[PDB]
Design a protein around this nucleic acid. Structure first.
Ligand SMILES: O=C(N[C@H](CO)[C@H](O)c1ccc([N+](=O)[O-])cc1)C(Cl)Cl
Ligand SMILES: [K+]
Ligand SMILES: [K+]
Ligand SMILES: [K+]
Ligand SMILES: [K+]
Ligand SMILES: [K+]
Ligand SMILES: [K+]
Ligand SMILES: [K+]
Ligand SMILES: [K+]
Ligand SMILES: [K+]
Ligand SMILES: [K+]
Ligand SMILES: [K+]
Ligand SMILES: [Mg+2]
Ligand SMILES: [Mg+2]
Ligand SMILES: [Mg+2]
Ligand SMILES: [Mg+2]
Ligand SMILES: [Mg+2]
Ligand SMILES: [Mg+2]
Ligand SMILES: [Mg+2]
Ligand SMILES: [Mg+2]
Ligand SMILES: [Mg+2]
Ligand SMILES: [Mg+2]
Ligand SMILES: [Mg+2]
Ligand SMILES: [Mg+2]
Ligand SMILES: [Mg+2]
Ligand SMILES: [Mg+2]
Ligand SMILES: [Mg+2]
Ligand SMILES: [Mg+2]
Ligand SMILES: [Mg+2]
Ligand SMILES: [Mg+2]
Ligand SMILES: [Mg+2]
Ligand SMILES: [Mg+2]
Ligand SMILES: [Mg+2]
Ligand SMILES: [Mg+2]
Ligand SMILES: [Mg+2]
Ligand SMILES: [Mg+2]
Ligand SMILES: [Mg+2]
Ligand SMILES: [Mg+2]
Ligand SMILES: [Mg+2]
Ligand SMILES: [Mg+2]
Ligand SMILES: [Mg+2]
Ligand SMILES: [Mg+2]
Ligand SMILES: [Mg+2]
Ligand SMILES: [Mg+2]
Ligand SMILES: [Mg+2]
Ligand SMILES: [Mg+2]
Ligand SMILES: [Mg+2]
Ligand SMILES: [Mg+2]
Ligand SMILES: [Mg+2]
Ligand SMILES: [Mg+2]
Ligand SMILES: [Mg+2]
Ligand SMILES: [Mg+2]
Ligand SMILES: [Mg+2]
Lengths: 80, 58, 135
RNA sequence: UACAAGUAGUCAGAGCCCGUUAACGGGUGAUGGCGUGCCUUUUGUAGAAUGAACCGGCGAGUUACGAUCUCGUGCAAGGUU
RNA sequence: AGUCUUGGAGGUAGAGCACUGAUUGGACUAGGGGUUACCGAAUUCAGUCAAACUCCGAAUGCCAAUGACUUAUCCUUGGGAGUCAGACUGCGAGUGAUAAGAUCCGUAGUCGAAAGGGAAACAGCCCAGACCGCCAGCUAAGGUCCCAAAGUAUACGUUAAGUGGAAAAGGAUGUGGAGUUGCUUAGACAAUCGAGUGACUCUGCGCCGAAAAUGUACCGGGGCUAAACGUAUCACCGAAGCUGCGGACUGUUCG
RNA sequence: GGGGCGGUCGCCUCCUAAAAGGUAACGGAGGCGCCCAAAGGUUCCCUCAGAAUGGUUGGAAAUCAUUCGCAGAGUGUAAAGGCACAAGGGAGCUUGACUGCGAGACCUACAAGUCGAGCAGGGACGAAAGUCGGGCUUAGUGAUCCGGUGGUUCCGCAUGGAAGGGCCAUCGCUCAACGGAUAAAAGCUACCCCGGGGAUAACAGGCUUAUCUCCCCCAAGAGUCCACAUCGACGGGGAGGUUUGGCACCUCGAUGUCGGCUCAUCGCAUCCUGGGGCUGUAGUCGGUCCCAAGGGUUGGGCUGUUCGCCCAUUAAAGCGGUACG
RNA sequence: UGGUGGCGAUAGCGAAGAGGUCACACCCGUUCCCAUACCGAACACGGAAGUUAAGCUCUUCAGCGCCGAUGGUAGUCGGGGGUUUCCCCCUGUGAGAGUAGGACGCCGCCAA
């Protein structure tokens, strides 16, 4: 005879993290980064959605950048 | 300069990424020789499959 | 018998014992010591047997530092059960010892007494050891 | 062909006996090398899994009406009963 | 698509103790106990450790960009499928007992669906991909005393155990190479005498520990003191690999 | 890791997860099936835990005050990632917890799920810039069919109506076995049957060796003294493959299963006999270890038994393997 | 000097000094606009009696914090080997820690 485990549960994996590369061209509205909280901040021409999703406001080139000492940001710069 | 790359060992039993590099050099057959221009691209391919190929300056 | 007062998790992974010891490779506190030459789990039962062996030989005549602590729990399933149906219950406690780790240190006795005390302890342990001194 | 250890063949090969749809021929085979049937089912079967005693015959994706795609032909903003 | 170049995301390996836990010794003591170190939490100094710790943090892998060099794939639509029992091996993990030819993932290979050579025999290991013919040649792994193709090769060492050709803690004047050190012709060491001797550390190769059932039976066999092991060198053998010669078919480009 | 029994079934968070993403097990830990009319929106303003020092009640801990104080707090709730130009605390005014939508993305077999600038309508707060399509983020949910309710420039079976249907909004599921077989469902079969499987258990084999049997290492001790005659705590290392198991690799188009009988045969870890060392060996007896497998190794009572106990012998009444021969 | 930006504490904390006429402060009023869960503390609105004490500005310091090589080592991609819970070798790559050292501000714009 054997007992049983009280574990065995997990949630569906949420596919977080970077969705476009540094240097990649993106259209306006392209999701750049999915996250919980602000692991990366919205930089120039980048918005933060209600669930902390970072998205391009313009068409342009994605740039993940250092933001001060500890933090990071992602920006989209117009092609020119 | 031109390198002269010969496939000494078989691609059988080798990781896919090595087999692709060997094939991208134009080596489709064991003991086949191909001639390429000596540059950082071709040298970098040789480096990845150095255990499979023999090289000599032409 | 050494064990933690409490632990965060009662059931840990067994882990791996690659590499030499991170720290405690030199005789720090005492004068002499016994160094591991091989990786092993050292149970709290082995530490106690080793401790009493060396301590008894010295005749209250010197101090002992146990440099390893059996922090890691190990589990076992009940006797004669099939595989699965959850992880086994906690059984005992082990210290993870890697090559280079000084296990015990002695002070307040001669080298002759220390050598013999640590020899007697070495026979209680499941690993090859060597006698070491502070540099 | 009665000193031999054999999935029975195969490749090598004397000797002997023949003589053809005339071919770098036919029969036999001392001896040497290599070699665990076929099928099914399997991760994997020489399999100590399955099936067949042998031989012969018989014995399994068809047709109808619809649908769809490819190809072909006729006509073509029409085509067809 | 590969590679180089450039940029980026991310927290593993390692490491570290800055946080959370765990944790060793000393210093110094709130405070609570027998005015006391009588014992003491914090504090402080040093010291350990972590899948669910992180002040840190690789190699790789991944996502891109720009050219270059190379390669010939890629995408879309439509017709037709089969597959949804996988296996072992290496590496990274879990479960297990850091058992299983176990189980369950990740990753690469081979088998599956792969014949040939090697590993005695041996799907999954090593080498290597069989269009067909040849009584040509060169090689791979693995080999070169005989079975059995090729060295009874060369040079310098090691081993005496058939170790090689199963097995641990531990035990030991086995033996080779290093190094440290005490004592000694002002006479050591052994038992006055006459040259060494006696401790230790690292290390090569051996020894014991080593008992199973039909028959040697833990090199495939013979047998081997090298025909073993180490290091180096050169010959040669060796596949259905590659080459040569001839033939067939398929594709691409211009017969 | 056969089935039954137990446990589980959907969703969220973490670890396993091998620094993108994804990733399994009846692996390791926890949560959810809500809550809030502010705990939402906006504007303005602010800074927390704890400690030290001082204080009538008042104490370690209420309330002051001072200094120190990256957060050692808080964030409705699990956890993770975030958060002090706060996402934490306070106050004023509010209802954007809006209607029509939506370039473009993420995720993804499908069904679904997620993010979204921006445009229009009409608002909230703000001097304005602007922010606002609920809540720091990620759970708090359930297809279709069918039925109810509200709305409706739709249809209305000759025509006008109506019945009824459509469309938009919304309600009715622990359909929790949570992609939901029916609106509606429990047992027994040793009276059993068929199709299948060695894909999967019971026998034996195989792998493994936790357990088991045997052998060792260290030597604290016991033994008047004395570790080592004999025994050997705490610990440590093996061998065997006879035990109980683990695994599910051969066999389910059959590999008969306990005990006995008949016939044995092999191993040696030796029960007897032979030869020895040590002895806490005076002798006679013994103990222990070494060599030794040549031969030998009983008749009964009870029980299906094996085993075991017992009676009576014996030089001895060995232990194992051979599909528990 | 004041305002206002950019740059990872190399910008900070701490310590010791120095400087104010104008400018910036503290400061002195609460009548009014406005204000405090109580308070002109703060926020407001007004003033210039005097003070560089503090903030602010400028210098000196490496005590703490921060930045930080080189070399070595751990790990490791790829390729091999072994006595295989692991270990070793080779081409490459390469931390963390520790340390040399750096650093008590660097670059704007406007006004006075
Ligand atoms: O069932 C039989 N034998 C099977 C093989 O088909 C096997 O040998 C077996 C025997 C006994 C057993 N048991 O005792 O549980 C199980 C299987 C027949 Cl002999 Cl009846
Ligand atoms: K033959
Ligand atoms: K059968
Ligand atoms: K694998
Ligand atoms: K031998
Ligand atoms: K099982
Ligand atoms: K409010
Ligand atoms: K279901
Ligand atoms: K049987
Ligand atoms: K033994
Ligand atoms: K059966
Ligand atoms: K005998
Ligand atoms: Mg998750
Ligand atoms: Mg929301
Ligand atoms: Mg004859
Ligand atoms: Mg004969
Ligand atoms: Mg099978
Ligand atoms: Mg047969
Ligand atoms: Mg069958
Ligand atoms: Mg038959
Ligand atoms: Mg027939
Ligand atoms: Mg680690
Ligand atoms: Mg698999
Ligand atoms: Mg398996
Ligand atoms: Mg992957
Ligand atoms: Mg198949
Ligand atoms: Mg293949
Ligand atoms: Mg083969
Ligand atoms: Mg062969
Ligand atoms: Mg086959
Ligand atoms: Mg040759
Ligand atoms: Mg020969
Ligand atoms: Mg041998
Ligand atoms: Mg070929
Ligand atoms: Mg049940
Ligand atoms: Mg990864
Ligand atoms: Mg990941
Ligand atoms: Mg229905
Ligand atoms: Mg009508
Ligand atoms: Mg379901
Ligand atoms: Mg269903
Ligand atoms: Mg009955
Ligand atoms: Mg009846
Ligand atoms: Mg039946
Ligand atoms: Mg099976
Ligand atoms: Mg069985
Ligand atoms: Mg069998
Ligand atoms: Mg014991
Ligand atoms: Mg068994
Ligand atoms: Mg299986
Ligand atoms: Mg049969
Ligand atoms: Mg014997
Ligand atoms: Mg039997």
């Amino acid at each position: 005879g054997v007992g049983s485990t009280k574990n065995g549960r997990d949630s569906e994996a949420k596919r977080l993290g970077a969705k476009r590369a540094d240097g990649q061209f993106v259209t306006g509205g392209s999701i750049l980064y999915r996250q919980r909280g602000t692991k990366i901040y919205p930089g120039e021409n980048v918005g933060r959605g209600g669930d902390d999703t970072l998205f391009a406001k313009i068409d342009g080139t994605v740039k993940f950048e250092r933001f001060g000492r500890d933090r990071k940001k992602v920006s989209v710069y117009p092609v020119a | 300069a031109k390198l002269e790359i010969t496939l000494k060992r078989s691609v059988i039993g080798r990781p896919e990424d090595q087999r692709v590099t060997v094939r991208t050099l134009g080596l489709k057959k064991t003991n086949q020789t191909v001639v390429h221009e000596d540059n950082a691209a071709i040298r970098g391919m040789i480096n990845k499959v150095s255990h499979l190929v023999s090289v000599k300056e032409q | 018998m050494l064990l933690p007062k409490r632990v965060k998790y009662r059931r840990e992974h067994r882990g791996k014992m690659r590499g030499r010891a991170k720290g405690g490779t030199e005789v720090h506190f005492g004068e002499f010591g016994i160094q591991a030459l091989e990786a092993s789990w050292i149970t709290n039962r082995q530490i106690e047997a080793a401790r009493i062996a060396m301590t008894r030989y010295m005749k209250r005549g010197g101090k002992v530092w146990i440099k390893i602590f059996p922090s890691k729990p190990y589990t076992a399933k009940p006797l004669e059960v099939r595989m699965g149906s959850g992880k086994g219950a906690p059984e005992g406690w082990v210290a993870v010892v890697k090559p280079g780790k000084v296990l015990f240190e002695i002070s307040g006795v001669s080298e002759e007494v220390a050598r013999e005390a640590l020899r007697l302890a070495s026979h209680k342990l499941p690993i090859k050891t060597k006698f070491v001194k502070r540099e």
